[PDB]
Design a protein around this ligand. Structure first.
Ligand SMILES: OC[C@H]1O[C@H](O[C@H]2[C@H](O)[C@@H](O)[C@@H](O)O[C@@H]2CO)[C@H](O)[C@@H](O)[C@@H]1O
Length: 488
């Protein structure tokens, strides 16, 4: 439950919260109203959790993308500044916080990821992703690495994934098609494939997270990192001589970071809505208010026209804006939340080798355990496909095995005719099917199918497919019966 004569604010711990607290101190001096600034972990998830019982902060700071979901659920107060105030901020920043015709937050700043590079290691940073492996080998021989960035959050890997064609939700005449997701298409696969072979080639580590990449760059251990304007303060402190530049191209195309508008929403259960509007409108969104936050941790390109114009000469801000121009604004639709957890899981699963990129992105796109046909009929001379597939909770072992057995009709015993094991198909030269079996399976899609060519009358019998995918060293089986005809 929310008290009542004061303001509690949540903001991410990577942003200028001490600078925000100082604006809080000034508000408190003028008004006598206490302003507490907190930075809870995963506050983007904590907010809806507690705001559903009417709990949480009076005001929450996050990128605009999460606010559609908050608004849909009725967690945010409608924002109603007059036209005079609105005119103080860029119109596009207001569009980012409009949901279902209503303004539901105040925009603060435009963030995009950039390439950051150590000028003493790399006076001339690569223009291209494809250069990076060769660069890394050079730098490795000198006890350094080429690149480290946060691999745990899809925000950071998305620019590469989207570069050659990936998208979240298709944008089509004024609206997002929630049914048309582009995390599976050929472009997205190429981008994530490039990323996982950086890892498989030891140019990056699948475990690398935000703290590890920041520490490595700031200690001069790696030549480049990918991060937003909040990060620049920490590198200034370290003294590393850095530049901030355009992200490398991939297959000749710009990297495409998702652009965020840092925004401040007012809790619908806040008894302090007029005080919150006063703070944000009269204290935060002023040159001095934004300056105080910005000098703590850089904001990016601020929403407030006067101060954006003041800051716009900074070439690090120019680079941020150039990267944003090449990327695209995040949708603010409530589905964004599902999108992010889907791609997060796909990246981690692909980066660790639990899935191939195809498998991984299929699942993201979407977010009797053995199957054979019952009975197949063939003509003499024809070929028949003997489908076999399975479903499992396990990743695909490789060590995965498939075995086909055959039992002639009226016959006694089932004999092996085909075996897939340790990555290779073996036929059997014993076979009455020798030179007539064809492997058409693919263990990566949990498929063990074969084709029998040039059917004969005496091929009549029952085939059994047996699959082991080790965890899972217990054989699951299914049977298919073949009848061969002159015709029918
Ligand atoms: O990684 C998925 C995550 O990415 C975007 O979050 C950013 C946020 O915009 C930045 O301000 C910065 O703090 O880093 C975050 C990524 O770690 C989305 O805003 C967020 O909803 C999403 O879950």
């Amino acid at each position: 439950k929310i008290e009542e004569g004061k303001l509690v604010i949540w903001i991410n711990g990577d942003k200028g919260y001490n600078g925000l607290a100082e604006v809080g101190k000034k508000f408190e001096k003028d008004t006598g109203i206490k302003v507490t600034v907190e930075h809870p972990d995963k506050l983007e998830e904590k907010f809806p959790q507690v705001a559903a019982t009417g709990d949480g902060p009076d005001i929450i700071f996050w990128a605009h993308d999460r606010f559609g979901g908050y608004a849909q659920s009725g967690l945010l107060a409608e924002i109603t500044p007059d036209k005079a105030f609105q005119d103080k901020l860029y119109p596009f920043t207001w569009d980012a916080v409009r949901y279902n015709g209503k303004l539901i937050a105040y925009p603060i700043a435009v963030e995009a990821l950039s390439l950051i590079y150590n000028k003493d290691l790399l006076p001339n940073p690569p223009k291209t992703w494809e250069e990076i492996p060769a660069l890394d080998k050079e730098l490795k021989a000198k006890g350094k690495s080429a690149l480290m960035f946060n691999l745990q959050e899809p925000y950071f890997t998305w620019p590469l994934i989207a570069a050659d064609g990936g998208y979240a939700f298709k944008y089509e005449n004024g609206k997002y098609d929630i049914k048309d997701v582009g995390v599976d298409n050929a472009g997205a696969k190429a981008g994530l494939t490039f990323l996982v072979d950086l890892i498989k080639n030891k140019h990056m580590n699948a475990d690398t997270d935000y703290s590890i990449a920041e520490a490595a760059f700031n200690k001069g251990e790696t030549a480049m990192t990918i991060n937003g304007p909040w990060a620049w303060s920490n590198i200034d402190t370290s003294k590393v001589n850095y530049g901030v530049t355009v992200l490398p191209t991939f297959k000749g195309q710009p990297s495409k970071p998702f652009v965020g508008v840092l925004s401040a929403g007012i809790n619908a259960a806040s008894p302090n809505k007029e005080l919150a509007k006063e703070f944000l409108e009269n204290y935060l969104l002023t040159d001095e208010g934004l300056e105080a936050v910005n000098k703590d941790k850089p904001l990016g390109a601020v929403a407030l026209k006067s101060y954006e114009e003041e800051l716009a000469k900074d070439p690090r801000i120019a680079a941020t804006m150039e990267n944003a121009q090449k990327g695209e604004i995040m949708p603010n639709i409530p589905q964004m939340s599902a999108f992010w957890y889907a791609v997060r899981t796909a990246v981690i699963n692909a980066a660790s080798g639990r899935q191939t990129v195809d498998e991984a992105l299929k699942d993201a796109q979407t977010n009797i355990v053995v199957y054979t046909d019952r009975e197949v009929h063939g003509a003499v001379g024809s070929q028949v496909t003997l489908h076999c597939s399975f479903w499992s909770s396990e990743w695909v072992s490789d060590d995965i095995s498939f075995t086909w057995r055959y039992q002639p009709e009226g016959g006694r015993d089932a004999i092996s005719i085909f075996h897939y094991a340790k990555g290779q198909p073996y036929i059997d030269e014993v076979g009455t099917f020798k030179e007539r079996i064809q492997w058409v399976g693919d263990p990566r899609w949990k498929d063990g199918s074969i084709v029998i060519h040039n059917l004969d009358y005496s091929d009549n019998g029952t085939f059994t497919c047996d699959v082991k995918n080790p965890p899972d060293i217990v054989g699951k089986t299914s049977q298919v019966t073949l009848y061969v005809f002159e015709k029918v």
